[PDB]
Design a protein around this motif. Structure first.
Motif, PDB file in Angstrom:
ATOM      1  N   UNK A 140      -1.576  17.434  -2.256  1.00  0.00           N
ATOM      2  CA  UNK A 140      -2.521  18.524  -2.461  1.00  0.00           C
ATOM      3  C   UNK A 140      -1.819  19.642  -3.217  1.00  0.00           C
ATOM      4  N   UNK A 141      -2.068  19.715  -4.520  1.00  0.00           N
ATOM      5  CA  UNK A 141      -1.566  20.797  -5.361  1.00  0.00           C
ATOM      6  C   UNK A 141      -2.374  22.049  -5.033  1.00  0.00           C
ATOM      7  N   UNK A 142      -1.734  23.197  -4.788  1.00  0.00           N
ATOM      8  CA  UNK A 142      -2.465  24.331  -4.198  1.00  0.00           C
ATOM      9  C   UNK A 142      -3.483  25.003  -5.102  1.00  0.00           C
ATOM     10  N   UNK A 143      -3.291  25.007  -6.423  1.00  0.00           N
ATOM     11  CA  UNK A 143      -4.235  25.655  -7.328  1.00  0.00           C
ATOM     12  C   UNK A 143      -4.165  25.100  -8.744  1.00  0.00           C
ATOM     13  N   UNK A 144      -5.323  25.125  -9.398  1.00  0.00           N
ATOM     14  CA  UNK A 144      -5.611  24.431 -10.642  1.00  0.00           C
ATOM     15  C   UNK A 144      -4.872  25.087 -11.809  1.00  0.00           C
ATOM     16  N   UNK A 145      -4.450  24.266 -12.769  1.00  0.00           N
ATOM     17  CA  UNK A 145      -4.025  24.787 -14.057  1.00  0.00           C
ATOM     18  C   UNK A 145      -5.212  25.425 -14.773  1.00  0.00           C
ATOM     19  N   UNK A 146      -4.990  26.623 -15.306  1.00  0.00           N
ATOM     20  CA  UNK A 146      -6.081  27.510 -15.701  1.00  0.00           C
ATOM     21  C   UNK A 146      -5.889  28.029 -17.122  1.00  0.00           C
ATOM     22  N   UNK A 147      -5.641  27.126 -18.070  1.00  0.00           N
ATOM     23  CA  UNK A 147      -5.385  27.546 -19.441  1.00  0.00           C
ATOM     24  C   UNK A 147      -6.662  28.036 -20.119  1.00  0.00           C
ATOM     25  N   UNK A 148      -6.479  28.846 -21.161  1.00  0.00           N
ATOM     26  CA  UNK A 148      -7.551  29.171 -22.094  1.00  0.00           C
ATOM     27  C   UNK A 148      -8.669  30.040 -21.558  1.00  0.00           C
ATOM     28  N   UNK A 149      -8.514  30.605 -20.369  1.00  0.00           N
ATOM     29  CA  UNK A 149      -9.576  31.373 -19.737  1.00  0.00           C
ATOM     30  C   UNK A 149      -9.296  32.861 -19.870  1.00  0.00           C
ATOM     31  N   UNK A 150     -10.361  33.651 -19.961  1.00  0.00           N
ATOM     32  CA  UNK A 150     -10.227  35.101 -19.898  1.00  0.00           C
ATOM     33  C   UNK A 150     -10.147  35.562 -18.451  1.00  0.00           C
ATOM     34  N   UNK A 151     -11.189  35.282 -17.676  1.00  0.00           N
ATOM     35  CA  UNK A 151     -11.138  35.495 -16.237  1.00  0.00           C
ATOM     36  C   UNK A 151     -10.492  34.283 -15.588  1.00  0.00           C
ATOM     37  N   UNK A 152      -9.526  34.529 -14.717  1.00  0.00           N
ATOM     38  CA  UNK A 152      -8.833  33.461 -14.021  1.00  0.00           C
ATOM     39  C   UNK A 152      -9.627  33.071 -12.781  1.00  0.00           C
ATOM     40  N   UNK A 153     -10.070  31.813 -12.734  1.00  0.00           N
ATOM     41  CA  UNK A 153     -10.899  31.331 -11.633  1.00  0.00           C
ATOM     42  C   UNK A 153     -10.163  31.197 -10.306  1.00  0.00           C
ATOM     43  N   UNK A 154      -8.839  31.352 -10.279  1.00  0.00           N
ATOM     44  CA  UNK A 154      -8.154  31.503  -9.001  1.00  0.00           C
ATOM     45  C   UNK A 154      -8.030  32.961  -8.599  1.00  0.00           C
ATOM     46  N   UNK A 155      -7.903  33.866  -9.566  1.00  0.00           N
ATOM     47  CA  UNK A 155      -7.839  35.284  -9.251  1.00  0.00           C
ATOM     48  C   UNK A 155      -9.185  35.827  -8.803  1.00  0.00           C
ATOM     49  N   UNK A 156     -10.279  35.331  -9.376  1.00  0.00           N
ATOM     50  CA  UNK A 156     -11.601  35.807  -9.000  1.00  0.00           C
ATOM     51  C   UNK A 156     -12.033  35.320  -7.626  1.00  0.00           C
ATOM     52  N   UNK A 157     -11.387  34.283  -7.089  1.00  0.00           N
ATOM     53  CA  UNK A 157     -11.600  33.927  -5.692  1.00  0.00           C
ATOM     54  C   UNK A 157     -11.067  35.015  -4.772  1.00  0.00           C
ATOM     55  N   UNK A 158      -9.933  35.613  -5.133  1.00  0.00           N
ATOM     56  CA  UNK A 158      -9.388  36.697  -4.327  1.00  0.00           C
ATOM     57  C   UNK A 158     -10.171  37.992  -4.512  1.00  0.00           C
ATOM     58  N   UNK A 159     -10.967  38.103  -5.578  1.00  0.00           N
ATOM     59  CA  UNK A 159     -11.884  39.233  -5.709  1.00  0.00           C
ATOM     60  C   UNK A 159     -12.962  39.186  -4.637  1.00  0.00           C
ATOM     61  N   UNK A 160     -13.559  38.012  -4.429  1.00  0.00           N
ATOM     62  CA  UNK A 160     -14.633  37.867  -3.459  1.00  0.00           C
ATOM     63  C   UNK A 160     -14.135  37.879  -2.022  1.00  0.00           C
ATOM     64  N   UNK A 161     -12.827  37.746  -1.804  1.00  0.00           N
ATOM     65  CA  UNK A 161     -12.284  37.851  -0.455  1.00  0.00           C
ATOM     66  C   UNK A 161     -12.093  39.313  -0.077  1.00  0.00           C
ATOM     67  N   UNK A 162     -11.513  40.101  -0.984  1.00  0.00           N
ATOM     68  CA  UNK A 162     -11.351  41.534  -0.749  1.00  0.00           C
ATOM     69  C   UNK A 162     -12.706  42.229  -0.680  1.00  0.00           C
ATOM     70  N   UNK A 163     -13.658  41.815  -1.520  1.00  0.00           N
ATOM     71  CA  UNK A 163     -15.022  42.327  -1.439  1.00  0.00           C
ATOM     72  C   UNK A 163     -15.717  41.935  -0.143  1.00  0.00           C
ATOM     73  N   UNK A 164     -15.273  40.859   0.508  1.00  0.00           N
ATOM     74  CA  UNK A 164     -15.735  40.565   1.857  1.00  0.00           C
ATOM     75  C   UNK A 164     -14.943  41.362   2.886  1.00  0.00           C
ATOM     76  N   UNK A 165     -13.629  41.479   2.685  1.00  0.00           N
ATOM     77  CA  UNK A 165     -12.782  42.232   3.605  1.00  0.00           C
ATOM     78  C   UNK A 165     -13.007  43.732   3.524  1.00  0.00           C
TER      79      UNK A 165
END
Lengths: 48, 49
Positions: free
Chosen positions: B24-49
């Motif tokens: 189980x690799x912990x997080x996806x390779x995220x090339x070529x993106x403007x918004x990072x789809x692993x960083x935006x997961x932590x946006x919705x956690x703090x917005x919940x917290x």
């Protein structure tokens, strides 16, 4: 014919696209449904 | 993350303790993106917290 063919891709701009046919999409001044607050801030950049 | 099969180990015939060797690799390779789809997961956690 004069329509604005938008691309639909979230790509960072670089200044090598200045000579190409791509434009910045913040400055199209086209009203968008639901996102009127972004366009109303981009009306403030117009030259006087 | 995601579930990557161990294609390089089985082709090298390494010892594994499973039928399908899957780590189980912990997080996806995220090339070529403007918004990072692993960083935006932590946006919705703090917005919940």
């Amino acid at each position: 014919a004069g329509e604005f063919e938008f691309s639909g891709r979230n790509e960072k701009w670089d200044q090598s696209l200045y000579l190409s046919e791509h434009f910045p999409a913040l400055f199209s001044d086209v009203p968008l449904a639901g996102a009127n607050t972004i366009i109303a801030i981009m009306r403030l950049f117009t030259p006087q | 993350g995601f579930l990557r099969t161990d294609d390089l180990a089985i082709a090298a015939n390494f010892p594994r303790a499973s039928r399908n060797p899957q780590t189980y690799i912990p997080y996806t390779n995220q090339r070529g993106t403007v918004t990072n789809e692993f960083a935006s997961r932590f946006r919705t956690i703090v917005a919940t917290l």
